Structures are given as C-alpha cells and as structure tokens.
C-alpha cells in the first residue's frame, strides 16, 4: 500500500514480485534463528567492481547491528537482552560465502 495526495492508500497493481529479484541482486541475506522464532533480513551491499556508485558500506558486525535493532551494550551486541557476540552464537556459512 502507498498513499497518494488524497491522503489514503491504495492496493491495486502494486505487486511485490517486481521488487523481489532487484533486492536479491543488491543485498546479502542474513537470517537469525532463536529458540522460538526466525528472522530473515536483506541488507544492502556495495559493489567494489564498478566505482561510479556510492553506496555507504559497512562490516558484518555493523550489518547485524543495523539490520535488527541491536543495542551496543559495552562492546557486546544485545537483541532483547540476548547476547550476540562472535563467540556467543553459532554461525553458518555456505561454501561460496
């Protein structure tokens, strides 16, 4: 849904399909899995090959702090008073990554 100048919003022809793959070509897919829930986020990246683009890039710890709303507590990262450190969780990568 998107609001026009009339103040209310409309849902007609505004498909989600034609913003799937575009996002899936600019982003990294980061997924969190806790004991009851799971969360899938897409975080934007910066292509280092062609330099005409100016995308503000970051690191993976900052990417986790920016994707979820993560509170920097004393150097550690905390999500709903759950510690997420480089040593306090379990990370999984596929072979290309």
């Amino acid at each position: 849904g998107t609001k026009n100048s009339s103040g209310q919003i409309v849902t007609e022809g505004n498909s989600w399909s034609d913003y799937i793959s575009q996002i899936d070509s600019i982003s990294a897919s980061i997924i969190l899995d806790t004991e009851n829930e799971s969360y899938e986020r897409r975080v934007t990246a910066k292509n280092l090959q062609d330099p005409e683009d100016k995308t503000p890039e970051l690191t993976i710890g900052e990417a986790i702090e920016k994707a979820f709303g993560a509170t920097k507590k004393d150097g550690l990262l905390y999500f709903n008073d759950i510690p997420i450190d480089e040593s306090c969780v379990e990370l999984i990568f596929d072979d290309n990554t």
Binding site: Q22, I23, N47, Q49, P51, E52
Partner: protein, 77 residues
C-alpha cells in the same frame, strides 16, 4: 557542443567521438586516467536513442539506476 538530435541526454560529440564516462550522474569526457580509477569507456550512438534496441535508453543504461537485477557486464550500451 550539444547538438544531440535525439534527446538522449548526452553529449553528441561523446557519442560519435572517442567516448565518455558517466560519473557523479553526469557525462564527463573520457580521460585516459580512468581505467586505474576503475571507470570504463562507453561508445554509443547520437543518431538514435536506444542504440541496442533495449527498452532501456543510453542514459538509463550507462548510469546504473534503471534495474538492479541486470548483471554488471550488461551496463555498456
């Protein structure tokens, strides 16, 4: 020096002559100190807009702000 008959938003001399580079969303003349800067050179046509027959025109295709699912080697026109 803007006698582009087709209104394809670019220097017609940069179309017909040596080339150019889209940079900072503007068409700058191609320097020979841009390959080590990572930029490339694109050569296109002034006498027509869609110089490859695509539904994306030259200023849309060179400046990568048209569709992000396009692979990066399909950026030159």
């Amino acid at each position: 020096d803007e006698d582009l008959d087709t209104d394809n938003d670019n220097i017609p001399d940069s179309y017909e002559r040596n080339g150019y580079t889209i940079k900072d969303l503007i068409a700058v003349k191609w320097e020979d100190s841009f390959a080590e800067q990572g930029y490339k050179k694109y050569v296109s046509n002034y006498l027509e807009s869609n110089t490859a027959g695509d539904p994306y025109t030259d200023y849309e295709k060179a400046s990568g702000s048209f569709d992000k699912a396009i692979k990066t080697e399909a950026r030159d026109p």
